[PDB]
Design a protein around this ligand. Structure first.
Ligand SMILES: Nc1ncnc2c1ncn2[C@@H]1O[C@H](COP(=O)([O-])OC[C@@H](N)Cc2ccc(O)cc2)[C@@H](O)[C@H]1O
Ligand SMILES: Nc1ncnc2c1ncn2[C@@H]1O[C@H](COP(=O)([O-])OC[C@@H](N)Cc2ccc(O)cc2)[C@@H](O)[C@H]1O
Lengths: 305, 305
């Protein structure tokens, strides 16, 4: 099964409670990083399986900032720096989706991939109208009882109004896309369980409609941007890896079928000195983020050493 | 002293922690009532004393509804019915201010009286911008700890997001007028202690500036609108009054100096059958709300009976 393969690979951590699925990426920087990569893959796996996916840029929401999993209040971001980053991200996601569509074809009939931005619909949204329209459908108890929200709420200083209100936007986003694109599935890291929850409860209060969430593991400075992190630098992060991990990361960052992976490892023991599973993971990934060129301008770089 | 006379009269309940002072009136109906009258007098007393006052219509805030002192959630109001009422109120306050400026002159140099509406500045306010601009200055603990807010919060059903967010707007209003009109005093009934609090703390977080609040007693169906409640009907509310009260209501709803009042009462005992203090209170008030005509078309009405 589709979900089977992904839960099995270790990509689809959990789920609650032709389709359309989405995941958001807050443009709090101009570059995506290796962690973002994992959520994005989740989309790529659903896309290959034939589904339509939407990778959303948080032009609006990054002005505020996600409180989720954070113990400290963020440095409010200049409304313009966030506008820039949002345009960098869009570019970055169309870029990735680009490599993925040529360098990893499988003859399967694929689904669409679309980059949206929530600023598009927030720029037409006036405070009291929003509040008047929806505010009456968010029970305060509900919002107050997210586990995502305790680190900041229960903090010594407390949580700004903004931080708290953040979840409400994300909840609304899910509602919006669901309305306009019939999208009934949201996906993100585990840190996003709370927010997604708000979404499906909210949608459920309004329409008896059942939508869904899916999470993926969180992995534990590494940029998808050639400018920030060279294709070579990036290769090194995946090559300098412990053997106990290269197992999971293969199942994590690559499309190699599980059997192909299996062999790679069983083979690795007959040749531990080879760093073979790393030389594979590193290749697969750098191919996806930086294209064939990037792989080459990294293969080459190390080799001479 | 000015505050002395008002605290003494029983009009200036409390205060915390040429000037400009304001009080808001939510257009949840097209008519003001006798209770509103008290808060408005508070303004009139400050205005006679020479100060500039602003009677604010809550065009925006009445769409939500004030949670303060309420045990139950309000029936969400049609955004259009609220627009109509807001235009009725503006008319009603310019009307009262009218009678007050002819039928109650005292040769003193008076201060300005201005009717504003918050919808004016909320209609230009976009959700994320507001949240982005200010949301970070409202500690959630603060907002969560108003006594105004417990009846609804601690309720079995809980409080909508809207109800809770209400205080935030009122807090912002005070900040707005203070910015634009250097207004540094807000006044309302006692039920409004909480909200006003939010205002001066918020202003204080932003500017070390000290602004202030003043409250007035709450009195315990009676419309300032000739259409709803005839000038005669209204006279009867003030005439059908217990002697233990006519004392306070004179000090409450009239401008008669305290000595003049004193006599009226000491006189009343020599003639209890006269209902003299009531025939005075009733006259004073009906004169202010319905003008000389109204007094007459009420004096006349009863007399023939
Ligand atoms: N190191 C990592 N390892 C694994 N996963 C990671 C890692 N870092 C980030 N992620 C995941 O990838 C996404 C990154 O977006 P974000 O700006 O960090 O989350 C903010 C998001 N709430 C923005 C949003 C906006 C609008 C919306 O509708 C939905 C969501 C999120 O789904 C997040 O859970
Ligand atoms: N029976 C009564 N006796 C004495 N006083 C009474 C009585 N009834 C009402 N009041 C007072 O008169 C005013 C009426 O406003 P309101 O819509 O009832 O409260 C809502 C308010 N938040 C409106 C507002 C809107 C915007 C804003 O910025 C400030 C305020 C308030 O100051 C209220 O406390």
């Amino acid at each position: 099964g589709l979900l089977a393969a992904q839960k099995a690979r270790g990509l689809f951590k959990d789920f609650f409670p032709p389709q359309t699925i989405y995941c958001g990426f807050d443009p709090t920087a101009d570059s995506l990083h290796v962690g973002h990569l994992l959520a994005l893959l989740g989309l790529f796996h659903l896309q290959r399986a034939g589904h339509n996916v939407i990778a959303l840029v948080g032009g609006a929401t990054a002005r505020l900032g996600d409180p989720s999993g954070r113990t400290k209040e963020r440095e409010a971001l200049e409304t313009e720096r966030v506008r820039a980053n949002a345009r960098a991200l869009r570019l970055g996601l169309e870029a990735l989706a680009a490599n993925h569509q040529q360098l990893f074809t499988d003859g399967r009939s694929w689904g669409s991939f679309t980059v949206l931005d929530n600023s598009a619909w927030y720029q037409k949204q006036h405070l009291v109208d929003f509040l008047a329209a929806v505010g009456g459908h968010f029970r305060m108890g509900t919002l107050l009882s997210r586990q995502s929200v305790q680190l900041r709420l229960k903090s010594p200083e407390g949580m700004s109004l903004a931080e708290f209100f953040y979840q409400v936007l994300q909840a609304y986003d899910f509602y919006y896309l669901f309305q306009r694109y019939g999208c009934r599935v949201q996906l993100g890291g585990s840190d996003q369980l709370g927010n997604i929850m708000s979404g499906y409860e909210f949608i459920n209060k309004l329409t008896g409609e059942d939508v869904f969430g899916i999470t993926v593991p969180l992995i534990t400075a590494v940029w998808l941007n050639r400018d920030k992190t060279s294709p070579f630098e990036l290769y090194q992060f995946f090559v300098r890896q412990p053997d106990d991990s290269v197992e999971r990361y293969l199942k994590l960052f690559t499309f190699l079928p599980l059997p192909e992976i299996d062999h790679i490892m069983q083979l690795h023991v007959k040749e531990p000195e080879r760093r073979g599973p790393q030389k594979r993971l590193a290749a697969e990934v750098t191919k996806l983020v930086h294209g064939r060129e990037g792989l080459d301008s990294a293969k080459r770089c190390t080799q001479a050493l």
